[PDB]
Known about the structure:
The structure is a homodimer.
Chain A: H1 9-12, E1 15-20, E2 23-30, E3 33-37, H2 50-55, E4 62-66, E5 69-71, E6 73-79, E7 82-87, E8 96-99, E9 107-114, E10 117-125, E11 144-149, E12 152-162, E13 168-171, H3 197-209, H4 223-230, H5 240-245, H6 247-253, H7 257-270, H8 289-293
Parallel strand pairs in A: 8-12
Antiparallel strand pairs in A: 1-2, 1-4, 2-3, 3-7, 4-5, 6-7, 9-10, 9-11, 11-12, 12-13
One copy of the ligand O=C[C@H](C[C@@H]1CCNC1=O)NC(=O)[C@H](CC1CCCCC1)NC(=O)c1cc2ccccc2[nH]1 is lined by residues 25, 39, 42, 45, 136, 138-141, 161-162, 164, 168, 183-185 of chain A.
PDB class: viral protein
Keywords: viral protein-inhibitor complex, viral protein
Assembly: dimeric
Amino acid sequence: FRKMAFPSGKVEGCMVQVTCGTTTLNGLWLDDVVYCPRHVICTDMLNPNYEDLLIRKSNHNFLVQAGNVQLRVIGHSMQNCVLKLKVDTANPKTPKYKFVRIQPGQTFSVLACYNGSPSGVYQCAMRPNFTIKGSFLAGSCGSVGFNIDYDCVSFCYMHHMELPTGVHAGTDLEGNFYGPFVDRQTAQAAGTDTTITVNVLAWLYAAVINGDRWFLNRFTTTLNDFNLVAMKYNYEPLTQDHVDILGPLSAQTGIAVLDMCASLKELLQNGMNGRTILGSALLEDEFTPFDVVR
Amino acid sequence: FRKMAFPSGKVEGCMVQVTCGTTTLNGLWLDDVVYCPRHVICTDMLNPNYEDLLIRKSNHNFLVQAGNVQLRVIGHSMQNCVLKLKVDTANPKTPKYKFVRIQPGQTFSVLACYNGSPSGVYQCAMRPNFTIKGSFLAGSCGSVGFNIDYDCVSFCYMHHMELPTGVHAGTDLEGNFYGPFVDRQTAQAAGTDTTITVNVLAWLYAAVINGDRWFLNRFTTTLNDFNLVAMKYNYEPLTQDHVDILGPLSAQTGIAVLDMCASLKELLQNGMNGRTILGSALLEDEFTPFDVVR
Ligand SMILES: *C(=O)[C@H](C[C@@H]1CCNC1=O)NC(=O)[C@H](CC1CCCCC1)NC(=O)c1cc2ccccc2[nH]1
Ligand SMILES: O=C[C@H](C[C@@H]1CCNC1=O)NC(=O)[C@H](CC1CCCCC1)NC(=O)c1cc2ccccc2[nH]1
């Protein structure tokens, strides 16, 4: 069992470099628009007035490069916290795509990029406190997170900042931040994070579908008793929605959702006692019910 | 610190579907040759005479589809355990590439494919027992592993089989097996695996170069004394070469390798005791020194 990312080729053909003044970062070039974080126009960083910063720019202040080719910016506008640079040329490599806003617990692939060129790809989850536990470099802003389903790329994240705890914060591709964050270098802190309970359960089901049943037991639990216990370990409350979502995996393994909840309760109480589940010595929470079935 | 795969775009455009009679798997289309496991011509599998089975085949026995378009096979050829299907057209998406054979303990990215279509990418290490702890579907054969070095794709692995323990075995792209395995259906087992010591040290350096310091101590050991410790815990012997190739990581953050070996020596007896390292609670051996520095 591997945390697998989506093949990155469709996204690679979209990454460009955007430079404004002394700042360069990455942009996403789809059709004839380049999307990048609006803070590329900052020098300024504690209290930027982006409306005032932007009206003073003209098209030639934005240097956009796709590989060796410089694209000509013919217009620009701001949509929430993303800048949209209109360019003279449509990206010939534009894939089928959509912009989607995800909820906490969702997973996606990140194409980490620097100077417009892709560096690596890895799988991420949106944490319950709306941060990402990413691996992001000095000039990684504008790198995007995405899923691919039937040749259609769903762009769900664009990178903007690193919080002082070392986790990461960013926006959807319409420029709205995930979580209570703003593009200012002001004191802001991520809420206390929690473990994604529905994902841990999905992964225990994956463990059952593959090798192992050693963590199962003879007990069941009510939903409320499970939540009362699990929250004492900083697990997210499990909702009826989550119970419904786990239905197909329950049906496939013959283990009722509340029976798997009993197993998780005991795993939290006992630990794993030198054993491993799918390859892990910790309870994994970055695989969704959807990810397991695939 | 995340396990990062190479961006897979350059390889995605080489993946095709090969069907022979009843069996479908993946092929690698480079220039005017498609490469795939020779066991695609089996039905038979318990002891094949591949030369005999191949002379019985003709070009039209091989159905090669590059997505929508069928490629016409105009020649067929075996090299060790890989079949070479000459097709009428050079792949216009052929990247700069070479065929390389890797050493146990080296890492690479796997592009898992099914029906000739890329499905996921992840980072792998070649185990000391020459197996791969992969994630491979029913029709994953022909999927490849690779590294990228400045526009050149170095192919090092093509997938052939799953051993009874659930680990995986394959060849290089010249058809030579990694490990003491053969392409026939028969009892074969992986040799007892060991842990890749130099990679564990690199991962520890990835923690000190990062932030963590709590496994560090004031002490040092000898290569001989450390190698006596490695044996009880089934760790690969640390060679004067490994120490040297780590030297660039020692030199940087002020920790001699044998200084970090003293830390690893104590870790092999104390455990973590609730503390992570980079962001994990087990000694990780799938990052090379080059993987950490890059
Ligand atoms: C190719 O697509 C598959 C990939 C396997 C399938 C499941 N997971 C994988 O990685 N390859 C096979 O199925 C081979 C078939 C060839 C092997 C070499 C000789 C000719 C046929 N079979 C196995 O990998 C296999 C069979 C088997 C039976 C019992 C225990 C383990 C086991 N592994
Ligand atoms: O790519 C550029 C970086 C990405 C960062 C850098 C290191 N790792 C990353 O993910 N973005 C940035 O550096 C912007 C700077 C800022 C954003 C808000 C509006 C004004 C400009 N981000 C920041 O993450 C940041 C600054 C900072 C200062 C003190 C403590 C934590 C901090 N984090």
